């Protein structure tokens, strides 16, 4: 347990009177040791949350007190107590048997249909759903149009000037963005006028035909095609369930219309799905967990990248065990013939259910969510929002929704009316910039500061070559902060958790496989390959 009240006099300073707010801690510690019976897990969490607040209050009132170091060590044991509470509250409690995927804003790929089927094959004890937005199936076409059509206009305004004239070090994206801003701004004007009567797609069809003279008939044909494919896989339409509501519903359409960011939209939708159904959410790039242990008595080639080696293992399973029709040996090319045949013979001599792992019953504490934690650039792991396990009544989930709402409200409170006012992008980033420096709170951690610095480059994300704003607003960073909220008994922090501490909220590796072709194809999002504008000056 936590230490005893008498024991807690490691916090005594010789001949120093006890302060009233010190006694408060001493009383809360007194009762906590006794009153943990006739109790609930959440009320224990709240009592640990009171103890943490009392410590804060003391340390705040007496910044220079000699008791502080003792009380900080004491506070650390609240974390260890939280850790114990989490571990034994995931006893005899499991995640709902829902498995959810999302694919919104365009046609689904045929590889995704294979991956989805793979999940279906190995988890027949789950209700598996694939969520899409029937009303917004042209968002991907819209984003392309915005980019391609604005690229054209700016390249041709500078036809001769391509001989490093004035268009060097990609002054392109600066001028292109000024125009992309105008497009987005006129689309929002359209949207506001039509939204009561029209679907996002109808609004897009209106926008693309009136502004770029795109043919209605073709756009209509893309829609049906897109929708028929979703009908064929038995996708569930989100418009027809109460999944998105109130604030989240707003941010969803904001990502759909104002920023045209489907990844951000799908980050929002993710959260709403889990709060409605709970269970597992998975990215269509991942596959059921593979039993990689069994392949330990096969030594990976000296040159091999560990990831590509494991990718190759699965290609063998997929192929020999005939799990997928369209999964080539792309990463087994690198492997020499002798090793490949050991893999292939190892596969054929093992049972299929010995190789691929089912999700089964996942023990989960009502305090936690479980998250994928993938290796990053440095070789260190980091939270990913590609695989999330949570019941809907989860504390960390409420902190997650709180994080998202908090970050979006802050952002919209400074950009939205200035998007309504500012008629040009220059004027936009000036008016927005002054607002940043006037409203940023005084004392923000390294991270709190990093966050507010992102607001300016929000609109440009995905349109300017190396701006990735949405990690801070809907992506992984809000997960490590919602996790930090829970573990440190606070709310709406911008702070993040240490590797050691993140391990607590980590979803096991047996639960998902991430070394897949479509996943490696997604890793092209962060590259120095931004000078390949030369790919489209060749186009027109």
């Amino acid at each position: 347990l936590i230490t005893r009240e008498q024991l807690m006099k490691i916090a005594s300073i010789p001949l120093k009177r006890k302060e009233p707010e010190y006694n408060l801690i001493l009383d809360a510690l007194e009762n906590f040791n006794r009153d943990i019976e006739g109790t609930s897990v959440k009320e224990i969490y709240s009592k640990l949350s009171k103890l943490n607040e009392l410590v804060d209050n003391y340390q705040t009132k007496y910044p220079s007190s000699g008791r502080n170091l003792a009380l900080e060590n004491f506070r650390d044991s609240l974390y260890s107590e939280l850790r114990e509470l989490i571990k034994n509250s995931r006893t005899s409690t499991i995640a709902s048997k829902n498995l959810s995927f999302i694919w919104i804003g365009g046609p689904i790929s045929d590889q995704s249909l294979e991956y989805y089927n793979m999940w279906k094959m190995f988890n027949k004890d789950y209700n598996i759903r694939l969520f899409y937005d029937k009303n917004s199936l042209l968002v991907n076409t819209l984003k392309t149009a915005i980019i391609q059509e604005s690229s054209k206009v700016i390249i041709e305004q500078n036809q001769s000037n391509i001989l490093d004239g004035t268009y060097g070090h990609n002054k392109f994206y600066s001028d292109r963005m000024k125009l992309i801003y105008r497009y987005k701004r006129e689309l929002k004007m359209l949207y506001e006028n039509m939204k009561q009567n029209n679907s996002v797609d109808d609004i897009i069809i209106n926008f693309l035909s009136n502004y770029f003279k795109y043919d209605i008939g073709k756009l209509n044909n893309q829609k049906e095609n897109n929708n028929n494919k979703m009908i064929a896989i038995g996708a569930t339409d989100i418009n027809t369930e109460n999944i998105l509501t109130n604030k989240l519903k707003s941010y969803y359409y904001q990502e759909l219309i104002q920023t045209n960011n489907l990844a951000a939209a799908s980050d929002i939708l993710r959260i709403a799905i889990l709060k409605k159904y709970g269970g597992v959410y998975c990215d269509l790039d991942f596959l059921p967990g593979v039993n990689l242990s069994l392949f330990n008595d096969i030594s990976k080639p000296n040159g091999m990248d560990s990831n590509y080696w494991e990718a190759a293992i699965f290609e063998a399973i997929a192929n020999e065990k005939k799990l997928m029709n369209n999964y080539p040996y792309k990463y087994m090319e690198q492997v020499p013939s002798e090793i490949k045949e050991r893999i292939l013979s190892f596969v054929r001599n093992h049972d299929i259910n010995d190789l691929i792992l089912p999700l089964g019953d996942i023990k989960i504490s009502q305090l936690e969510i479980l998250l994928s934690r993938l290796k990053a650039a440095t070789g260190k792991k980091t939270f990913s929002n590609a695989f999330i396990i949570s019941n809907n009544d989860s504390l960390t989930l409420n902190n997650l929704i709180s994080q998202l709402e908090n970050r979006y409200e802050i952002l919209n409170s400074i950009i939205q009316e200035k998007f309504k006012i500012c008629e040009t992008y220059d004027s936009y980033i000036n008016s927005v910039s002054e607002l940043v420096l006037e409203t940023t709170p005084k004392n923000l951690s390294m991270d709190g500061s990093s966050f507010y610095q992102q607001i300016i480059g929000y609109l440009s994300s995905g349109f300017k070559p190396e701006v990735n704003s949405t990690v801070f607003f809907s992506g992984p960073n809000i997960y490590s902060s919602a996790t930090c909220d829970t573990y440190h008994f606070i709310k709406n922090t911008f702070d993040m958790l240490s590797s050691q501490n993140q391990e607590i909220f980590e979803a096991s590796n047996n639960l998902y496989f991430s070394k897949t072709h479509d996943e490696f194809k997604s890793s092209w999002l962060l590259r120095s390959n931004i000078a390949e504008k030369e790919f489209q000056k060749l186009i027109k």
Side-chain angles (χ1 to χ4, degrees):
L1 220 171
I2 304 185
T3 61
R4 137 212 204 209
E5 186 205 12
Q6 325 284 302
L7 181 63
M8 157 80 99
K9 289 73 177 282
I10 170 81
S12 87
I13 298 301
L15 295 174
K16 164 161 194 158
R17 290 178 78 79
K18 289 159 172 64
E19 307 94 321
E21 35 282 309
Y22 178 37
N23 285 320
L24 284 190
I25 294 156
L26 254 26
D27 294 2
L29 186 65
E30 173 78 294
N31 294 316
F32 179 86
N33 291 326
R34 190 179 50 88
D35 290 3
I36 40 160
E37 224 61 49
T39 200
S40 47
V41 166
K42 280 191 172 173
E43 285 305 290
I44 300 168
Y45 179 92
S46 75
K47 272 179 193 191
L48 293 163
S49 190
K50 260 87 187 286
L51 280 154
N52 182 75
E53 202 179 294
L54 298 177
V55 168
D56 263 321
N57 289 353
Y58 181 93
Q59 293 188 322
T60 284
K61 185 152 195 194
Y62 316 104
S64 58
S65 173
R67 308 199 146 112
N68 285 356
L69 181 63
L71 281 168
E72 198 73 25
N73 290 344
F74 164 70
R75 172 192 267 146
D76 286 354
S77 63
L78 307 174
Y79 301 151
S80 285
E81 184 76 357
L82 209 176
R83 279 173 77 184
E84 279 303 309
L85 187 63
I86 286 165
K87 279 177 192 172
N88 88 292
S89 59
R90 55 173 137 200
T91 234
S92 79
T93 69
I94 62 163
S96 300
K97 287 188 181 194
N98 295 316
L99 174 61
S100 296
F101 301 89
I102 297 170
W103 189 264
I104 50 163
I108 194 167
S109 77
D110 288 359
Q111 284 88 346
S112 295
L113 298 190
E114 288 266 46
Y115 288 41
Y116 184 57
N117 186 61
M118 182 80 40
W119 282 106
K120 270 183 171 171
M121 276 170 67
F122 289 95
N123 298 283
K124 289 175 203 165
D125 56 336
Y126 277 74
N127 292 337
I128 299 173
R129 288 171 195 84
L130 175 44
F131 287 94
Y132 84 116
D133 187 338
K134 185 190 198 207
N135 282 182
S136 82
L137 281 158
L138 293 177
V139 187
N140 180 61
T141 276
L142 171 67
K143 190 190 175 193
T144 296
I146 295 305
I147 289 168
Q148 290 298 325
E149 216 63 34
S150 57
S151 289
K152 199 178 175 165
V153 169
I154 295 308
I155 288 180
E156 288 166 359
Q157 280 199 289
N158 303 263
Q159 289 201 75
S160 278
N161 228 317
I162 57 96
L163 295 174
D164 286 270
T166 187
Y167 262 59
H169 204 73
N170 315 114
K171 187 186 134 75
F172 177 73
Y173 303 106
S174 294
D175 273 303
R176 190 177 75 175
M177 182 67 50
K178 293 188 199 162
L179 193 66
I180 288 172
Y181 177 83
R182 263 169 178 139
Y183 290 159
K184 291 181 148 199
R185 214 185 155 256
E186 281 182 311
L187 180 70
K188 196 197 172 50
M189 268 161 66
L190 266 198
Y191 176 79
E192 293 299 327
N193 284 200
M194 287 191 272
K195 62 170 177 191
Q196 281 301 306
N197 283 22
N198 295 282
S199 66
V200 167
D201 278 346
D202 293 324
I203 298 170
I204 295 172
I205 292 171
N206 205 291
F207 178 74
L208 294 185
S209 71
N210 294 290
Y211 279 77
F212 306 130
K213 290 191 190 177
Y214 278 46
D215 169 50
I216 307 311
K218 285 168 200 173
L219 287 170
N220 290 342
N221 186 72
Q222 276 179 56
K223 265 170 58 193
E224 282 308 297
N225 287 339
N226 291 4
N227 200 39
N228 290 346
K229 198 177 189 180
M230 306 306 284
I231 288 151
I233 57 186
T236 71
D237 179 21
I238 60 103
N239 298 96
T240 207
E241 334 277 298
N242 273 278
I243 292 163
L244 286 165
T245 205
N246 301 310
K247 285 192 181 66
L248 298 192
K249 192 181 163 193
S250 293
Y251 312 143
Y252 176 77
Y253 290 108
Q254 180 182 310
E255 299 305 314
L256 234 55
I257 290 307
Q258 172 183 285
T259 72
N260 308 133
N261 186 358
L262 296 165
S266 172
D267 277 352
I268 302 167
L269 189 52
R270 206 164 305 217
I271 292 172
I273 298 288
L274 295 165
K275 210 209 190 152
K276 175 100 181 140
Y277 300 91
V280 185
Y281 164 79
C282 190
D283 210 277
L284 277 156
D285 291 346
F286 289 11
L287 282 166
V290 307
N291 206 322
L292 285 175
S293 273
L294 303 169
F295 299 77
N296 275 5
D297 308 328
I298 298 158
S299 36
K300 151 208 180 303
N302 296 339
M304 271 296 221
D305 178 10
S306 302
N307 297 326
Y308 301 150
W309 168 245
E310 296 166 335
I313 305 283
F314 179 67
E315 301 176 340
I317 298 166
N319 281 285
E320 286 308 291
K321 293 293 181 166
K322 289 183 282 174
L323 294 188
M324 266 153 138
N325 270 325
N326 194 12
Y327 208 79
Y329 281 101
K330 163 157 179 163
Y331 297 97
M332 191 109 284
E333 256 175 58
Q334 289 181 31
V335 159
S337 295
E338 286 169 351
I339 297 168
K340 167 170 177 174
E341 263 309 312
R342 290 190 66 205
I343 308 299
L344 291 205
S345 69
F346 199 92
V347 171
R348 63 169 139 267
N349 288 130
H350 280 244
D351 195 276
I352 207 151
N353 298 304
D354 194 351
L355 289 155
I356 308 301
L357 276 58
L359 282 167
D361 309 319
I362 305 161
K363 319 284 183 206
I364 185 158
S365 181
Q366 70 167 322
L367 295 169
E368 68 188 344
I369 60 180
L370 300 176
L371 282 169
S372 36
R373 254 171 44 93
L374 297 170
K375 295 189 282 157
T378 125
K380 54 151 275 183
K381 291 174 162 194
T382 188
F383 281 142
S384 181
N385 68 331
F387 191 86
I388 312 166
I389 301 164
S390 168
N391 284 324
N392 58 53
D393 67 345
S394 164
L395 178 76
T396 302
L397 190 74
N398 283 137
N399 288 338
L400 190 62
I401 292 152
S402 176
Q403 280 289 346
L404 185 82
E405 274 169 3
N406 183 66
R407 287 156 191 254
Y408 264 91
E409 284 317 284
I410 287 162
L411 170 83
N412 289 343
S413 73
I414 81 185
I415 65 147
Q416 287 299 232
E417 213 193 296
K418 279 80 217 299
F419 185 77
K420 183 165 190 154
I421 288 176
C422 302
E423 204 184 338
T424 169
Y425 189 55
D426 282 336
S427 173
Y428 171 80
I429 68 172
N430 288 337
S431 189
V432 154
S433 209
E434 79 130 31
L435 250 274
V436 161
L437 309 178
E438 288 172 22
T439 51
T440 303
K442 195 188 170 163
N443 294 313
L444 295 175
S445 71
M446 190 70 79
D447 287 323
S449 213
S450 265
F451 170 79
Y452 279 83
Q453 282 165 36
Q454 243 51 40
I455 298 159
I456 53 140
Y458 173 72
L459 280 197
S460 58
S461 184
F463 292 94
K464 191 177 170 189
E466 210 173 301
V467 188
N468 200 317
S469 267
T470 74
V471 197
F472 290 78
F473 304 93
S474 63
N477 287 358
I478 84 164
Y479 286 70
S480 48
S481 293
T483 292
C484 190
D485 273 358
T486 300
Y487 184 76
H488 285 153
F489 311 101
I490 59 193
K491 59 194 184 79
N492 297 348
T493 175
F494 298 94
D495 286 313
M496 276 151 257
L497 214 64
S498 65
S499 291
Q500 162 82 24
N501 278 340
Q502 291 182 15
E503 203 172 342
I504 296 162
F505 297 87
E506 192 177 14
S508 181
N509 270 328
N510 302 325
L511 258 21
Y512 68 95
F513 184 58
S514 62
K515 314 309 195 327
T516 64
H517 299 167
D518 281 38
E519 228 294 295
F520 293 137
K521 208 164 180 187
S522 282
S523 272
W524 278 99
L525 290 159
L526 201 151
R527 289 293 181 277
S528 67
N529 298 297
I530 58 164
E532 286 196 305
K533 143 195 176 296
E534 304 193 2
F535 200 82
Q536 75 201 64
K537 71 186 189 191
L538 197 85
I539 289 167
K540 268 204 182 178

